[PDB]
């Protein structure tokens, strides 16, 4: 019953020490087996099914999913879930911040968020557009769900979808090379580090940002 709670809580506390980094989390090969075993245990834990997931889990997932330390799996269901967890991070940031440099960082997160969210939605869309045949239902269903702030860009991708493979690749290939992924990797990485910094400083989380705070106090 609730010994299973205590075991699961303890397994979660171990993940917290493996996942919360100063910089970004990645699967080092010496930790894959235990991290996997911890995730599988929580995943099948009866007591954890309706439990509020800590925000360090979502952050570690985003860091892992987008390799922030062809490595990103551009799959509909996965990126949709990834965007949902990125949203969970942002809501938690907003709530915790709502309680000079406070507003500078708060605004920086808001701009990096939308820009990162756009980048993810865009590159998922590019991946829909590279397939043959296209899945028009899911492509549309994805744009409706996630790109509703960048509506004119999605309108343009929607009417690009009517063209056959050759022209789709030429638009996608040229637009990939105008703004490459490295831009969004950098924006996304910065949103995570900026969110971590805010939450530790003001909202009393612990993201191992003590050394980062001392460097900003030094004046560089």
């Amino acid at each position: 019953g609730s010994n299973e709670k205590i075991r699961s809580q303890s397994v979660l506390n171990t993940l917290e020490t493996f996942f919360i980094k100063e910089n970004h989390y990645d699967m080092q090969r010496e930790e894959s087996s235990i991290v996997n075993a911890c995730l599988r245990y929580l995943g099948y834990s009866k007591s954890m099914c309706h439990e509020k997931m800590p925000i360090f889990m979502d952050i570690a997932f985003i860091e892992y999913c987008f390799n922030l330390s062809q490595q990103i799996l551009w799959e509909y269901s996965l990126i949709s879930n990834a965007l949902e967890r990125l949203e969970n991070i942002e809501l938690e940031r907003q709530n915790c911040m709502r309680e000079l440099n406070k507003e500078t960082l708060n605004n920086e997160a808001l701009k990096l968020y939308s820009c990162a969210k756009a980048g993810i939605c865009r590159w998922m869309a590019f991946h829909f557009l590279e397939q043959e045949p296209i899945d028009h239902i899911n492509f549309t269903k994805f744009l409706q769900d996630w790109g509703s702030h960048n509506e004119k860009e999605m309108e343009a991708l929607q009417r690009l979808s009517k063209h056959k493979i050759r022209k789709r690749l030429i638009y996608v290939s040229q637009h990939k090379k105008k703004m490459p992924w490295s831009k969004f990797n950098s924006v996304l990485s910065r949103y995570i580090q900026c969110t971590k910094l805010q939450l530790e400083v003001f909202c009393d989380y612990d993201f191992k940002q003590r050394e980062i705070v001392k460097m900003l106090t030094s004046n560089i």
Binding site: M27, L42, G43, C49, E51, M57, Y64, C65
Partner: protein, 32 residues
């Protein structure tokens, strides 16, 4: 009792879905 997945003893919830997504990324990166 209310949650029929709980009654059935089947896995579900945030931690399970996180698990599935994490595994997909691994499977993808293991032969890349």
């Amino acid at each position: 009792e209310a949650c029929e997945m709980c009654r059935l003893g089947l896995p579900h919830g945030s931690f399970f879905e996180l698990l599935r997504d994490w595994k997909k990324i691994e499977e993808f990166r293991n032969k890349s």
